[PDB]
Structure formats: C-alpha cells, structure tokens
Amino acid sequence: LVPVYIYSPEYVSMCDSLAKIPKRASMVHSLIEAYALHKQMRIVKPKVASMEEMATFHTDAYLQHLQKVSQPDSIEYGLGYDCPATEGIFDYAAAIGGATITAAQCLIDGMCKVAINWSGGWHHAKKDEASGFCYLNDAVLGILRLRRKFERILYVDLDLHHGDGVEDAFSFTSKVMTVSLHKFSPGFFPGTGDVSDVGLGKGRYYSVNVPIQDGIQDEKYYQICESVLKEVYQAFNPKAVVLQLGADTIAGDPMCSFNMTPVGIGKCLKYILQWQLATLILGGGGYNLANTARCWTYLTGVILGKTLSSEIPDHEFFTAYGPDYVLEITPSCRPDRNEPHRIQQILNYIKGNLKHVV
Ligand SMILES: O=C(CCCCCCC(=O)Nc1ccccc1)NO
Numbered sequence: 425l426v427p428v429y430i431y432s433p434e435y436v437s438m439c440d441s442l443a444k445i446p447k448r449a450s451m452v453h454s455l456i457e458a459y460a461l462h463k464q465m466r467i468v469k470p471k472v473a474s475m476e477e478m479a480t481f482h483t484d485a486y487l488q489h490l491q492k493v494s495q496p497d498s499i500e501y502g503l504g505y506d507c508p509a510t511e512g513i514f515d516y517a518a519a520i521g522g523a524t525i526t527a528a529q530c531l532i533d534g535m536c537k538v539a540i541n542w543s544g545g546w547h548h549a550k551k552d553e554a555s556g557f558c559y560l561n562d563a564v565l566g567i568l569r570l571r572r573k574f575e576r577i578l579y580v581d582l583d584l585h586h587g588d589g590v591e592d593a594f595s596f597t598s599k600v601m602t603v604s605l606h607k608f609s610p611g612f613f614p615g616t617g618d619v620s621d622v623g624l625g626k627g628r629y630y631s632v633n634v635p636i637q638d639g640i641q642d643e644k645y646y647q648i649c650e651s652v653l654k655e656v657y658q659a660f661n662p663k664a665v666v667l668q669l670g671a672d673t674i675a676g677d678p679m680c681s682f683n684m685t686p687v688g689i690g691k692c693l694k695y696i697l698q699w700q701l702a703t704l705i706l707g708g709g710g711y712n713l714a715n716t717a718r719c720w721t722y723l724t725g726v727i728l729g730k731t732l733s734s735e736i737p738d739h740e741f742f743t744a745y746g747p748d749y750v751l752e753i754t755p756s757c758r759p760d761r762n763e764p765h766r767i768q769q770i771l772n773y774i775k776g777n778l779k780h781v782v
C-alpha cells in the first residue's frame with residue numbers, strides 16, 4: 425500500500441549520461457535520498473525493455489538502427505541536434521522505457537496505488553523518429569502496459585511543452601485521454617497542439633490541449649488545471665492515470681516561460697491523487713537542475729503526504745542549492761501575459777468538447 429519508486433545506481437547513471445541533462449537523475453534521486461523519502465517507498469529495480477517490449481510502439485527498424493548507432497542513416501530516424509547519437513543511447517532509451525514499463529507493471533500487479541519514475545516522461549518521440557531530446561516515448565509504453573488491466577487510461581501532461589507524441593499515439597482511440605497544459609506560440613517546440621486539436625476518428629474529443637502564455641503562476645495554473653480535470657474526470661471516468669510533471673514550467677528554468685512553484689504543480693498532484701486511481705508519475709523537462717530536484721523532491725513529499733524540511737540537507741550535490749539553501753522557490757517577477765479573457769474563451773471550447781465524451 426506504499427508507493428513504488430523506480431531506482432537503481434545503474435539506471436540513475438544511465439540517465440545522467442543523457443547529454444541534454446547531465447547529472448539530473450543523480451541530483452534528483454540524491455535530494456530525495458537526502459530527505460530520506462526513499463525509505464518510505466518500495467524501491468523497485470527497473471527491468472531492461474526487451475527489443476519486443478519497445479516494439480509495442482516504436483517501429484522495429486528504428487530500434488535496430490538505434491542499436492548499431494549506439495555501438496548517414498541517422499537523419500532518417502529523427503536523430504539530429506536535439507537528439508545526438510551518443511554511443512550508446514540504445515541502452516539509455518531502453519532503460520527509460522523499461523523503467524516506465526516496470527512502474528506500470530507494479531500498478532497492474534496491484535503492487536501499489538502510485539509508482540514513480542522521475543527519469544521518464546519523454547512525451548515527444550514518435551513511432552519511427554526521435555524528437556525533443558526524446559528517443560523513446562516511455563509514456564506511450566507506460567500507457568500501453570497499463571491498458572492490460574485498466575480500460576480507460578488518462579494521460580495528463582503538465583510539462584511546459586505539448587505531449588505531442590503521447591497525443592499522436594492515442595489520438596485515434598477513445599480508450600485513452602490526453603490532457604496537455606502547455607505554452608503555445610509559433611517557433612516554440614513542438615508547435616503542435618492548439619486547443620482546436622482534439623483527436624481524430626474513433627477518439628475525437630479524446631485529446632484536450634490547453635494553450636497558455638508566459639507568466640502564469642500557481643494561483644491561475646491550479647485554476648485551469650482544477651477546472652479542466654474536474655470536467656474531464658467526471659466525463660471520461662478513467663481507471664488509471666499517467667502524470668507527466670515536467671519541471672520546465674518552474675521559475676528559474678532557463679526556458680523562462682511559465683512561473684510555477686512546485687507548490688502549484690503539487691496542488692494539481694494533490695487533486696489527481698484524491699481520485700484514488702492507479703497513478704504512474706513521470707518527470708520530463710527540467711533545465712534548472714537544482715530547481716528540478718527541488719521540485720520533484722517536493723512532489724515525492726505530497727505523494728507520501730509528508731511535509732518536508734525547508735532547509736536543504738547536506739549530500740553529494742549540496743553546493744548546487746546555494747546561495748539560499750532552501751526547498752522553496754521564489755517566482756520571478758514578470759507579466760502574466762495570459763489575459764483572463766482568452767482563458768474563459770478556452771475553457772468553454774474545451775467544456776463543450778467534453779459534452780461529447782462519450
Ligand atoms: O522540454 C522538453 C524537451 C525539449 C525540446 C524542446 C527544444 C528546445 C531546444 O532544443 N532548444 C535549445 C537547444 C539548444 C540550446 C538551447 C535551447 N519536453 O517537454
């Protein structure tokens with residue numbers, strides 16, 4: 425009845441080797457270890473995602489190319505600047521999926537109410553192509569696995585970016601719903617998913633997308649979140665939840681767009697949690713490394729329902745939390761360019777869309 429925490433040194437170190445965020449998992453796990461919160465969770469070692477296990481969603485050519493490469497044909501398979509070809513990513517990606525699959529497996533074995541995989545949450549990678557630092561849509565692998573025991577699954581995406589890859593995969597079906605809350609403005613990755621984009625075919629209206637602009641703090645974010653999800657849950661009536669809790673919305677992230685504190689996102693986490701559903705907790709974006717570790721450290725708190733010591737404790741990465749050495753984050757002071765006009769104009773458009781589900 426206690427939460428499953430996906431950890432191993434071998435995993436964490438694989439996850440530190442992803443170029444675009446060196447030492448982030450180390451840091452994350454470390455601040456958590458430091459607050460001793462891992463001792464209040466069942467630590468589960470993640471399995472290696474088998475060639476087939478990954479092939480559930482990723483077209484086998486890809487998963488074969490990415491293996492040779494990890495030991496010319498790189499530009500085909502979506503690799504680029506965003507996604508280097510570091511020998512060897514094949515194991516890196518195969519550890520994130522495996523972790524997310526392991527977490528989902530616990531949930532479906534009845535091992536826990538909640539499973540955590542901070543290292544996962546790569547909501548961009550497509551079936552045949554890498555995109556957005558994402559090599560492997562581990563959420564998709566998480567949801568697919570969850571779909572063996574549970575009927576209706578709900579993906580909620582609270583990362584700064586659009587969960588496009590998760591949206592894509594389940595845009596056709598009505599058996600999975602995606603709520604993504606993100607920035608929308610052209611040029612800004614991935615530049616898919618305006619409110620209008622709602623899912624196609626047998627699963628039309630089964631894709632929510634909330635476009636938001638810079639400046640938004642907790643107060644207003646919880647509003648849009650508590651709103652949407654309330655109407656989504658009542659309508660969709662899901663059997664399990666998959667949460668992507670990207671850190672790049674938070675103040676101090678060099679991506680400097682939203683203005684969240686972990687408290688605000690944690691209020692949303694508190695909300696989703698009260699549903700007493702099976703819940704898969706994934707990370708995502710996080711580019712202020714300390715703020716990220718602060719953030720997911722915090723969140724593990726609310727999952728465990730344990731309020732945390734404000735003073736950061738000493739450990740490996742203590743120095744990173746200076747100068748003020750605390751868990752809380754101060755919002756930056758800059759305009760909330762979300763006119764309260766357009767917000768209500770967005771709720772309705774969504775609210776009316778939910779009158780169709782299902
Ligand atoms: O945050 C993410 C993945 C990030 C992918 C967005 C692309 C941003 C990017 O590549 N910008 C950049 C590249 C090099 C240096 C500075 C910014 N998931 O939501």
Ligand SMILES: [Zn+2]
Pocket residue numbers: 583584585670672708709710
């Ligand atoms: Zn992001």
